[PDB]
Amino acid sequence: PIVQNLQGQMVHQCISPRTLNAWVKVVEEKAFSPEVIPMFSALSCGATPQDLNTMLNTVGGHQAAMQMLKETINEEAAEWDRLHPVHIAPGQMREPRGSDIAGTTSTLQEQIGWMTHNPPIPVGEIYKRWIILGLNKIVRMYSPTSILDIRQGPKEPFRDYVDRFYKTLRAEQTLLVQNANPDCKTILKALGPGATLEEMMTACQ
Amino acid sequence: PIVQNLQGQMVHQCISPRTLNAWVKVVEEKAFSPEVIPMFSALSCGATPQDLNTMLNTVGGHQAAMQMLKETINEEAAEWDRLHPVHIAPGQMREPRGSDIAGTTSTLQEQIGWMTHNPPIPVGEIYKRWIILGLNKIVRMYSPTSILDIRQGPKEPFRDYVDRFYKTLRAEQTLLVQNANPDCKTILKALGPGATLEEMMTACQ
Amino acid sequence: PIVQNLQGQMVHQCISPRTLNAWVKVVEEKAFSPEVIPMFSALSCGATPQDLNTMLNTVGGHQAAMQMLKETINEEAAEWDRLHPVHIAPGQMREPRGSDIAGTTSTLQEQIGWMTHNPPIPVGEIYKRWIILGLNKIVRMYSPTSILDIRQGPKEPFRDYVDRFYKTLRAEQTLLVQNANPDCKTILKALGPGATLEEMMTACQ
Amino acid sequence: PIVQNLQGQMVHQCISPRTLNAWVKVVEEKAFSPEVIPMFSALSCGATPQDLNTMLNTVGGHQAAMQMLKETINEEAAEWDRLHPVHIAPGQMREPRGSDIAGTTSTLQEQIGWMTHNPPIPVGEIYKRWIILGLNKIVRMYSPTSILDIRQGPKEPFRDYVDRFYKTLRAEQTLLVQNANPDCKTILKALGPGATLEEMMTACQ
Amino acid sequence: PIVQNLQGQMVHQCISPRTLNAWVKVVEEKAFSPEVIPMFSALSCGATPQDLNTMLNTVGGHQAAMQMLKETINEEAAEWDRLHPVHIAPGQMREPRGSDIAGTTSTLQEQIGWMTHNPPIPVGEIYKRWIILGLNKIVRMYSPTSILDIRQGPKEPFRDYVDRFYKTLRAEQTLLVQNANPDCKTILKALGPGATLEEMMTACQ
Amino acid sequence: PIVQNLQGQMVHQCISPRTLNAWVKVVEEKAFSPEVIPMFSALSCGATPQDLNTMLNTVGGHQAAMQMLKETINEEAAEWDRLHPVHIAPGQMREPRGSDIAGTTSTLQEQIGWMTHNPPIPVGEIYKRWIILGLNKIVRMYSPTSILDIRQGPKEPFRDYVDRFYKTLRAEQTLLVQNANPDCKTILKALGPGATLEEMMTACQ
Numbered sequence A, B, C, D, E, F: 001p002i003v004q005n006l007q008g009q010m011v012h013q014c015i016s017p018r019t020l021n022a023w024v025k026v027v028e029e030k031a032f033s034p035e036v037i038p039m040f041s042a043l044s045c046g047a048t049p050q051d052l053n054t055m056l057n058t059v060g061g062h063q064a065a066m067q068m069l070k071e072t073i074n075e076e077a078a079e080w081d082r083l084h085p086v087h088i089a090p091g092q093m094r095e096p097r098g099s100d101i102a103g104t105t106s107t108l109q110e111q112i113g114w115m116t117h118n119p120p121i122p123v124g125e126i127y128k129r130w131i132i133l134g135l136n137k138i139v140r141m142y143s144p145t146s147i148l149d150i151r152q153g154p155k156e157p158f159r160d161y162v163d164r165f166y167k168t169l170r171a172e173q174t175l176l177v178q179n180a181n182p183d184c185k186t187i188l189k190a191l192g193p194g195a196t197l198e199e200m201m202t203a204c205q
């Protein structure tokens, strides 16, 4: 990543073994559950494109997902090149193409040059956005259940049902009441409109 | 978070893999037991709003709770906007709205600008207060037992009973004596008024 | 905590995830065995009152103990206010009350101001003393056995007996010989007065 | 490795116990699965040739692989010497031979001298390229299955089949449709040409 | 401990949670096996007397040993006071007594003052020597077996026997041949005088 | 060890708990498998003689090996004294004897003085060489099998056989073909001379 040193200059630092292991382990344990995306984003804080490829490339499983991700990245790269055509002046900085942002045709030094320029050409942040776009599609693809099929069991605590409901809604990216069981549905219908989730949860507790 | 470097300037630092993992693990292991709140507060020391959302968003379970939390945050944000209406001067700092404090409509750079201003506009601390307000409501909601139902068993050591009593009181946010078993109740009644907890515990040991 | 930076100024630093976890784990594993107190003291090196409350508040169990601790803290705070009555001059430092030392009515900034003043008003150290006073009372309360009941078994190695003896004495805060078994008692009686523990242990080995 | 200090000079640092352990553990757990190579590359960020040999030499198993790697390294070293023949001026820097790049005939001090020269003679990066060339050959050798033999089972979810397919293709370094089972093959044939992987995966979900 | 900062001044640093845990764990796992002493010495590098007491006091078991250690420390302290009698000049440094070196009657500030004086009065190193003296006595006391009773079994590999022999000798603080089994004894007798351990081990392999 | 600080001076640093634990654990898990030596060398990067003794002395088992190591060290020390006889000028640096290099008769301060002199008298590196010489002898002694006895089983994959072969050769410090099983021997004989290991392994795959 690029970080501020103690003196206050923006310097490149090696990606840490702790960061590398954290990402690999979270993918092993959580696959593409929605909460993996904000973990990815936080673990890649200050990442160069090189770092971002490192993180993606260190994943051993899920190669169907990783191939879908490349497709998304290539679509975003092509759209970048459409909006940002490029024409080298000796010792000067060239303008990044899509594949330079994605780290496949740019060097680490070029990446550092862009990201620490004044003003910065934030190739790490641009690439991270494309990756997250791609990961969101994967999360939704691998979401196993429609919210229409999240219905409260006859003996299921309301809390547990609501957990399943909003878990599913998050992965999928009135119905809460309609899908409740008969006893809690009746209680919730008599709360009237504009009840908060807290009030519903209290009511069916 | 925003931290003091070695030289003494307030700089942004990436949230650490250790911090991220600690929060996720404490929620996995403790759910919304009351002691999770001071852990949250300590793990988010110096946090930007971005960091605070990261921590909340990396939680995979408990989505009923996370949705209740958003409701609380939105109520606190709306009350902020009521008390702090906002009117951009080129190169100048805009005033934060509720949704800027909550990190949903403000950039990391804006957040850093506010938090390191002289005097600081402490958007991380303001947001953390709203979050803790929300978490406290959740702790109380998920508190399983009334203090009225914490009663000492016939063979239950007084210490163990008092542990359950104050554990419950903490989650719920004279009765100690009334809920004691017959033998310890008699001992405690004869200590008279103004006995300390230490003296009660000694007496029934 | 407040620490010396690399340059040599006294700066506030966030309490680390490692420190937080170490304290929580030691309480989980050891409860109020006497050795927990020096661990507490070492883990809270340079602690502000805020840090000290964090450590105490992150403990999930033992709420009978934590309530006894508050009582001790309140007694020490009241005695502080008796010896140190307080009368704000714009931009000047106010004098700390007991509840300010205990971190319940003082801000982090006030705490830093006191602890880094020249000379320092060491509110973290003062509060830590009160807490340790309280923890010592708890260790003694939870000490399960009188030293009078630590007696050497007929087949019990002398070393193991002495371990139990001094373990108990430490928790409780001639008898070694009297409580020894008949065979070792006879050996120890013939060593005469002024035998070291080493010599006794050698003698009964 | 060679790193930037806080002041901004390029200094040698000892390889960390964390880095050493991470590499050894990844080889123990993953052997020569393709994802081990980007992990190697990231763990050896800023590595001297000495560091690179350390990492390779700390591997206890897989000595057939490590011997094949030496062969590749020696071929790359010989090709370096063919393109870069060398002729010592007192106190001056000598030009590196292949075996100097590979760290077998150069000292740590010579390596640091080359890597921190202006412009740098990047012996660590040159050697890392040769090593990765060698590791790629090993990954391919140890790839157990031809892509021709990755065929979807009659009850096998399409996702799981695609995972196996691209996993195999990666190790090996239209067919997706041809190797699908009859039911999904029919669905995929009716999508027509130019279907994305996402669309295929959606179609057979 | 007292350490050199980045600038090069001798500063106090808090004892780390990692150091504290390492010591406690090594005592839990190894008790007073001889190798615990060099681990102690290395873990207490730069330690103040306060740090040294912390390490000793965090040990929960082995209180017979810890009491023997105090006896040794008190003997060394008394001998210090015999050789170094002491007579306070306002703002000046007082001379340390034995109990000041042992950290029982000196403050952390006094300890830092002595250890960072020019020339240093190395109270941490002096105390560490007394502690190690004490620990050595304990290692020897808890050594379970005489070297006279380490004899090679009829089927026991010579290597394993030599391991037991020198393990015992280390704890206890020609015979190798005499205690060997008949077959290896005969081989070793025919090597003649001045055989190295390597040659003996080769001979009986 | 001696390290470069952030400013760029060569300073002494305490050996870290992580380093100490890594060495102890690698010896526990791997004993004197050949790969332990490069791990030792990397873990003792920048080590003083004091640090090197610490690492060796913290090993609890393998005392036959540790005694053989001392013998090797004493032979290397005696040869040092033969080549480097020594004659103290007030405030000046004395010349190191063999036992000073081995850290048994020199102080930490003397060691630092030699290692940071201009030019450095690299006593840590000199001692490390002697230790590694000694460790190599031990690796070879504890090598359990002659390369003559590594022969491919009738059903043994060629890869697994080659792994055992080069593993053994490494510990021991044409035959590959001769020791292959009949079927692979025939294949390898028909490749002709100058086949690479890769080509042999491909051929028998």
Ligand SMILES: O=C(O)c1c(C(=O)O)c(C(=O)O)c(C(=O)O)c(C(=O)O)c1C(=O)O
Binding pocket: A018, B018, C018, D018, E018, F018
């Ligand atoms: O191994 C490290 O270099 C390290 C250490 C460490 O010195 O033990 C610590 C640490 O002080 O405990 C920390 C840490 O602050 O938690 C880190 C870390 O930043 O994660 C590291 C490390 O860089 O790995």
